[PDB]
Amino acid sequence: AACKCDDEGPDIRTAPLTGTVDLGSCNAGWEKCASYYTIIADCCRKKK
């Protein structure tokens, strides 16, 4: 699911709705763009 993000890897505050709703913590490659979102869910964008 598509999620609102603030920290798009290198180019941090550019493109808001980017991140995907991931569970807790992200694998290397998936850059924590909204590190925490809800309950036990976080939002990451792949490399960008």
PDB file of C-alpha atoms in Angstrom:
ATOM      1  CA  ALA A   1       0.000   0.000   0.000  1.00  0.00           C
ATOM      2  CA  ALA A   2       1.027   3.513  -1.052  1.00  0.00           C
ATOM      3  CA  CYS A   3       2.167   5.774   1.787  1.00  0.00           C
ATOM      4  CA  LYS A   4       3.179   9.385   2.445  1.00  0.00           C
ATOM      5  CA  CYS A   5       6.933   9.974   2.768  1.00  0.00           C
ATOM      6  CA  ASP A   6       9.335  12.742   3.789  1.00  0.00           C
ATOM      7  CA  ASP A   7      12.833  11.169   3.554  1.00  0.00           C
ATOM      8  CA  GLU A   8      13.248   9.944  -0.039  1.00  0.00           C
ATOM      9  CA  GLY A   9      16.811   8.643   0.429  1.00  0.00           C
ATOM     10  CA  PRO A  10      19.193  11.184  -1.198  1.00  0.00           C
ATOM     11  CA  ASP A  11      16.484  13.636  -2.350  1.00  0.00           C
ATOM     12  CA  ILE A  12      14.614  13.742   0.946  1.00  0.00           C
ATOM     13  CA  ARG A  13      11.680  16.197   0.688  1.00  0.00           C
ATOM     14  CA  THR A  14      10.652  15.959  -2.960  1.00  0.00           C
ATOM     15  CA  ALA A  15       7.943  13.376  -3.827  1.00  0.00           C
ATOM     16  CA  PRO A  16       5.480  12.779  -0.948  1.00  0.00           C
ATOM     17  CA  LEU A  17       3.343   9.703  -1.796  1.00  0.00           C
ATOM     18  CA  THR A  18       6.086   7.201  -2.649  1.00  0.00           C
ATOM     19  CA  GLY A  19       6.748   4.785   0.238  1.00  0.00           C
ATOM     20  CA  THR A  20       5.112   1.390   0.687  1.00  0.00           C
ATOM     21  CA  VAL A  21       3.628   0.197   4.005  1.00  0.00           C
ATOM     22  CA  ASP A  22       6.171  -2.319   5.326  1.00  0.00           C
ATOM     23  CA  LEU A  23       6.235  -4.169   8.672  1.00  0.00           C
ATOM     24  CA  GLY A  24       8.390  -2.681  11.451  1.00  0.00           C
ATOM     25  CA  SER A  25      11.802  -2.474   9.772  1.00  0.00           C
ATOM     26  CA  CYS A  26      13.007  -2.410   6.143  1.00  0.00           C
ATOM     27  CA  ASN A  27      15.626  -4.444   4.273  1.00  0.00           C
ATOM     28  CA  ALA A  28      18.715  -2.718   2.852  1.00  0.00           C
ATOM     29  CA  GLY A  29      17.632  -1.045  -0.384  1.00  0.00           C
ATOM     30  CA  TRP A  30      14.245   0.079   1.020  1.00  0.00           C
ATOM     31  CA  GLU A  31      15.035   3.540   2.395  1.00  0.00           C
ATOM     32  CA  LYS A  32      12.996   4.517   5.469  1.00  0.00           C
ATOM     33  CA  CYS A  33      11.124   7.544   4.136  1.00  0.00           C
ATOM     34  CA  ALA A  34       8.574   7.537   6.940  1.00  0.00           C
ATOM     35  CA  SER A  35      10.495   5.462   9.491  1.00  0.00           C
ATOM     36  CA  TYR A  36       7.329   4.917  11.570  1.00  0.00           C
ATOM     37  CA  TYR A  37       3.761   5.320  10.284  1.00  0.00           C
ATOM     38  CA  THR A  38       1.235   3.305  12.360  1.00  0.00           C
ATOM     39  CA  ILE A  39       1.156   0.632  15.127  1.00  0.00           C
ATOM     40  CA  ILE A  40       3.891  -1.759  13.836  1.00  0.00           C
ATOM     41  CA  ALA A  41       4.078  -0.382  10.271  1.00  0.00           C
ATOM     42  CA  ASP A  42       6.637   1.836   8.531  1.00  0.00           C
ATOM     43  CA  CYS A  43       7.072   3.355   5.035  1.00  0.00           C
ATOM     44  CA  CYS A  44      10.008   2.778   2.690  1.00  0.00           C
ATOM     45  CA  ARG A  45      11.004   3.694  -0.872  1.00  0.00           C
ATOM     46  CA  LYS A  46      13.403   1.538  -2.938  1.00  0.00           C
ATOM     47  CA  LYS A  47      16.758   3.374  -3.153  1.00  0.00           C
ATOM     48  CA  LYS A  48      15.276   6.773  -4.128  1.00  0.00           C
TER      49      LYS A  48
END
